[PDB]
Amino acid sequence: TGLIKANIPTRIAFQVSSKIDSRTILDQGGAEQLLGHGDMLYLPPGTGLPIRVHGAFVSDDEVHRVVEAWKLRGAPDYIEDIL
Amino acid sequence: LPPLSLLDPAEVKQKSYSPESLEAMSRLLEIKLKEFGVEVSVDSVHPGPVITRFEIQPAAGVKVSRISNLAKDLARSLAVISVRVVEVIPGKTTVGIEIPNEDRQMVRFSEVLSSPEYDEHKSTVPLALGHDIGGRPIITDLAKMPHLLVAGTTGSGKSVGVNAMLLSILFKSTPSEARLIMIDPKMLELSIYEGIPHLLCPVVTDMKEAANALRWSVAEMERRYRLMAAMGVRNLAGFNRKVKDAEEAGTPLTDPTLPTIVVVVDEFADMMMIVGKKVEELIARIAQKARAAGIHLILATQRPSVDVITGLIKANIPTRIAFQVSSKIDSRTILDQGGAEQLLGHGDMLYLPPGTGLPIRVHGAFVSDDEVHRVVEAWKLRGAPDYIEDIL
Amino acid sequence: LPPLSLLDPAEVKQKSYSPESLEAMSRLLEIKLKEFGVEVSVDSVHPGPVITRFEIQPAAGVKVSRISNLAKDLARSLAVISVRVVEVIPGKTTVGIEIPNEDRQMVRFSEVLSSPEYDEHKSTVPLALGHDIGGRPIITDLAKMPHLLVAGTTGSGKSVGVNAMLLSILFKSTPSEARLIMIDPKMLELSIYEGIPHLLCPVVTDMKEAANALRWSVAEMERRYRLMAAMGVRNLAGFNRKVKDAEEAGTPLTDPLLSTLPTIVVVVDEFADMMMIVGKKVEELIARIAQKARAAGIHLILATQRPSVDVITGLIKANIPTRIAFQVSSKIDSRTILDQGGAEQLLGHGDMLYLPPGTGLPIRVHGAFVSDDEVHRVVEAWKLRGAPDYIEDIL
Numbered sequence: 120t121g122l123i124k125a126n127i128p129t130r131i132a133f134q135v136s137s138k139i140d141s142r143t144i145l146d147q148g149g150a151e152q153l154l155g156h157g158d159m160l161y162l163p164p165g166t167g168l169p170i171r172v173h174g175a176f177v178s179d180d181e182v183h184r185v186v187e188a189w190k191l192r193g194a195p196d197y198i199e200d201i202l
Numbered sequence: 203l204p205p206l207s208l209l210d211p212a213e214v215k216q217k218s219y220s221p222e223s224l225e226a227m228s229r230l231l232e233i234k235l236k237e238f239g240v241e242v243s244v245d246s247v248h249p250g251p252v253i254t255r256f257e258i259q260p261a262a263g264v265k266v267s268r269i270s271n272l273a274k275d276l277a278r279s280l281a282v283i284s285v286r287v288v289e290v291i292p293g294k295t296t297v298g299i300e301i302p303n304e305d306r307q308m309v310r311f312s313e314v315l316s317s318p319e320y321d322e323h324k325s326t327v328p329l330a331l332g333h334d335i336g337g338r339p340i341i342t343d344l345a346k347m348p349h350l351l352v353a354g355t356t357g358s359g360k361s362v363g364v365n366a367m368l369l370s371i372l373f374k375s376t377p378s379e380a381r382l383i384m385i386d387p388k389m390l391e392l393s394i395y396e397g398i399p400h401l402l403c404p405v406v407t408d409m410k411e412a413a414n415a416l417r418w419s420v421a422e423m424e425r426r427y428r429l430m431a432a433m434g435v436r437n438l439a440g441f442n443r444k445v446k447d448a449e450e451a452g453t454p455l456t457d458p459t460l461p462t463i464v465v466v467v468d469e470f471a472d473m474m475m476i477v478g479k480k481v482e483e484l485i486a487r488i489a490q491k492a493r494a495a496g497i498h499l500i501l502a503t504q505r506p507s508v509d510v511i512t513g514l515i516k517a518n519i520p521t522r523i524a525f526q527v528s529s530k531i532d533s534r535t536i537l538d539q540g541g542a543e544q545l546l547g548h549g550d551m552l553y554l555p556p557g558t559g560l561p562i563r564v565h566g567a568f569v570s571d572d573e574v575h576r577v578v579e580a581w582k583l584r585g586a587p588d589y590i591e592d593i594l
Numbered sequence: 595l596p597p598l599s600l601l602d603p604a605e606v607k608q609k610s611y612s613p614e615s616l617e618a619m620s621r622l623l624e625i626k627l628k629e630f631g632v633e634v635s636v637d638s639v640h641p642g643p644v645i646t647r648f649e650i651q652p653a654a655g656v657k658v659s660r661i662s663n664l665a666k667d668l669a670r671s672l673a674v675i676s677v678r679v680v681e682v683i684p685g686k687t688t689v690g691i692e693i694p695n696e697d698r699q700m701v702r703f704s705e706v707l708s709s710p711e712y713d714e715h716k717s718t719v720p721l722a723l724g725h726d727i728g729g730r731p732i733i734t735d736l737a738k739m740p741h742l743l744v745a746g747t748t749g750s751g752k753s754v755g756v757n758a759m760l761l762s763i764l765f766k767s768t769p770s771e772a773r774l775i776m777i778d779p780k781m782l783e784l785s786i787y788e789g790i791p792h793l794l795c796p797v798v799t800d801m802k803e804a805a806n807a808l809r810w811s812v813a814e815m816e817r818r819y820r821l822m823a824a825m826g827v828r829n830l831a832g833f834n835r836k837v838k839d840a841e842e843a844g845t846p847l848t849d850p851l852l853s854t855l856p857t858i859v860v861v862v863d864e865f866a867d868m869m870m871i872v873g874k875k876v877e878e879l880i881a882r883i884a885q886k887a888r889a890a891g892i893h894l895i896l897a898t899q900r901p902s903v904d905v906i907t908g909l910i911k912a913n914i915p916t917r918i919a920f921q922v923s924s925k926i927d928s929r930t931i932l933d934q935g936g937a938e939q940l941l942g943h944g945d946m947l948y949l950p951p952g953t954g955l956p957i958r959v960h961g962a963f964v965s966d967d968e969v970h971r972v973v974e975a976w977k978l979r980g981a982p983d984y985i986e987d988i989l
């Protein structure tokens with residue numbers, strides 16, 4: 120809405136279909152000419168042109184390595200009241 | 203399961219449109235577009251069952267929208283009903299023009315299930331839709347989509363595609379594998395299946411007990427999530443793997459396999475009209491938590507208008523199938539992309555897989571009422587009915 | 595049955611536009627378009643009773659919008675009211691133009707009835723509308739509409755056409771096959787049918803009275819489905835041939851929870867006032883019956899005199915796809931009733947566009963002007979057959 124977008128300045132658009140959606144999130148017609156596979160437009164904090172920055176591909180396998188490495192040297196920490 | 207040969211074998215017929223006739227059509231297309239304000243060059247013709255794709259290297263300088271605003275004019279200059287104009291094909295510099303044939307042949311359904319991409323396919327819920335424009339078979343997994351919406355203009359072959367999907371389930375199913383619930387607010391055509399083992403309830407006509415069945419769907423979803431979370435497997439498929447491999451040791455895992463329940467809803471327009479927005483939120487939560495639950499959803503609408511196919515329905519469901527819809531307001535409505543005005547009818551699926559992709563144009567296979575009756579008789583001989591008393 | 599009788603004798607008229615004047619009109623159209631920015635090669639003509647069908651083969655390098663924009667401007671140049679542009683002909687290359695012809699016949703209702711086709715409609719509930727642009731009779735079956743929506747801005751005829759379809763129901767039926775119930779917003783005209791042996795209730799006036807009749811129809815549809823599913827057969831016609839083959843030689847069956855259940859027809863004169871008095875109950879009950887009415891044999895014939903979106907909603911366009919639109923005065927309304935457009939360019943006096951079940955191809959139908967005289971003659975000739983037997987549980 121005009122109540123969440125106006126509160127949060129910095130936003131990143133991936134490939135969306137319409138130019139209408141490009142004017143929806145980025146408020147500038149850029150987010151329709153991308154390629155998929157993590158082709159971002161980085162609308163920076165502040166104002167300028169969108170900075171086209173590629174994503175970084177990471178598989179689930181390296182994520183499993185990170186999960187196990189934090190299970191080794193890690194211990195849980197929960198709060199009851201938040202649920 | 204019954205053998206495939208209970209239904210009609212292949213149409214022993216092909217009307218080979220000659221290279222003479224295709225060359226004549228190519229030069230006719232060239233001269234007719236030269237008469238309008240474009241300049242054109244046909245290079246390669248790829249005929250097919252219903253249409254005939256013409257790739258085109260256009261002349262230097264011409265745009266593409268100046269082609270795409272010539273649909274009606276090219277149609278009346280070629281004497282068809284519509285000329286769908288594909289504006290992009292990857293890998294080439296071509297503008298696709300699709301032109302219907304003279305003798306529109308019919309897609310036999312055994313020809314669809316004659317494919318090795320159906321035969322070696324082993325997911326429990328394939329939905330064999332039919333042939334692509336090059337006669338290539340297209341079977342998409344419902345376990346990967348994992349929802350699909352169907353639309354058309356009343357009698358363009360909505361329920362024909364639904365019958366195709368249901369037979370595509372039934373020819374690769376046991377009731378341990380697959381499982382059905384058929385909500386239908388009209389009782390017209392989907393009632394024929396009533397008696398097969400793969401159901402859970404009768405063909406639910408009245409919509410308030412259909413809402414009971416949808417709340418039962420949400421409850422079975424939650425119960426199945428708690429069952430998998432107690433057993434510690436992500437999705438349904440690996441869970442069935444673990445269960446049957448522990449069964450092969452000799453110990454069925456006790457309860458603190460599972461069926462791939464498919465709950466179809468033909469014509470949820472009356473579902474969202476008779477009972478209010480709570481049915482829409484039931485569709486919302488079902489289509490939210492589904493792809494690991496093995497609870498897939500098949501929808502249908504005779505009206506693709508914005509107050510029926512509302513953004514909450516369009517929220518989860520990636521995959522959409524459009525038949526011949528009335529105008530480009532409705533094409534932009536459902537497919538989120540123009541084009542679906544310009545189909546021919548009688549089972550023309552603009553298929554749309556999940557992902558930012560150009561839509562695939564495929565044709566349904568015309569399955570009769572009679573073959574449906576044959577399959578119903580074959581299963582009610584082969585399998586016994588099975589239900590749940592207090593499902594509603 | 596009443597014989598083919600009490601109709602107006604189709605009088606001798608012979609003004610069938612000999613091809614001298616037709617060739618003159620064709621060259622006149624070629625000039626009067628050549629005056630504007632189009633080149634036109636006229637090909638062949640289909641002369642008819644009301645309009646005259648033409649086939650323009652346009653020249654090389656011209657669109658169709660260069661015809662369709664200047665419908666008004668051509669219309670002020672041919673001494674007509676308004677011409678109509680057909681943008682697609684089935685199977686040919688031409689572009690259609692229907693010129694209003696300034697000497698018309700009234701399409702006699704007997705001429706519709708005296709077709710071979712009307713004697714060959716097997717169904718008990720036909721709909722005899724009139725002739726098309728060729729003059730061939732266009733008769734539809736009400737069992738495969740499955741419902742009907744009527745438009746018209748107090749224009750051509752909106753009362754006529756309803757009266758025409760109702761008298762066409764009456765000429766091939768029995769009261770043991772098809773009994774109707776009307777709801778009358780303005781008690782003006784169809785309070786004339788009282789006294790016939792197929793009319794299940796007297797005239798209904800109030801919308802708050804009419805909600806009782808609508809809920810009676812819903813309850814009758816529900817017990818109809820209970821009775822069908824207790825007998826296994828899907829719809830009504832299979833059930834009636836089942837009761838034929840059951841009690842043919844004598845094999846009794848009564849009270850399954852007994853004769854053929856009649857094909858009930860519910861008709862509405864002015865649906866606008868029905869929504870305007872009762873806003874919410876009526877429209878949801880109409881969509882309820884439009885959902886479950888086709889198999890039950892209960893049918894619904896609607897008719898609005900205002901083509902607004904306040905009246906015609908998606909809830910009314912939920913399950914009534916067959917549209918009959920008369921002349922309306924708004925292209926916005928022309929795309930309100932029909933999914934296509936162009937229904938403003940008609941002529942009046944019994945002219946409708948017929949939109950068939952499903953497929954988008956608007957048939958143009960000239961409705962048959964039937965007088966009040968034949969209405970309250972056939973009523974009197976039909977009151978011989980019995981008394982207006984009533985089921986007073988409707989209210």
Ligand SMILES: Nc1ncnc2c1ncn2[C@@H]1O[C@H](COP(=O)(O)OP(=O)(O)O)[C@@H](O)[C@H]1O
Nearest residue numbers: 356357358359360361362504548549566567568
């Ligand atoms: N592959 C096909 N070949 C021929 N006709 C088809 C084919 N697919 C659909 N149809 C036509 O579609 C119609 C069925 O439409 P249906 O699915 O019942 O839509 P609805 O339920 O809205 O009426 C039938 O008239 C049938 O002839």
Ligand SMILES: Nc1ncnc2c1ncn2[C@@H]1O[C@H](COP(=O)(O)OP(=O)(O)O)[C@@H](O)[C@H]1O
Nearest residue numbers: 700701748749750751752753754899943944963
């Ligand atoms: N083919 C015809 N030729 C001449 N007059 C006709 C024809 N068809 C209908 N009419 C007349 O035009 C009038 C239109 O009335 P209508 O618009 O139906 O009134 P309302 O809108 O109040 O029902 C009818 O009363 C009828 O007498």
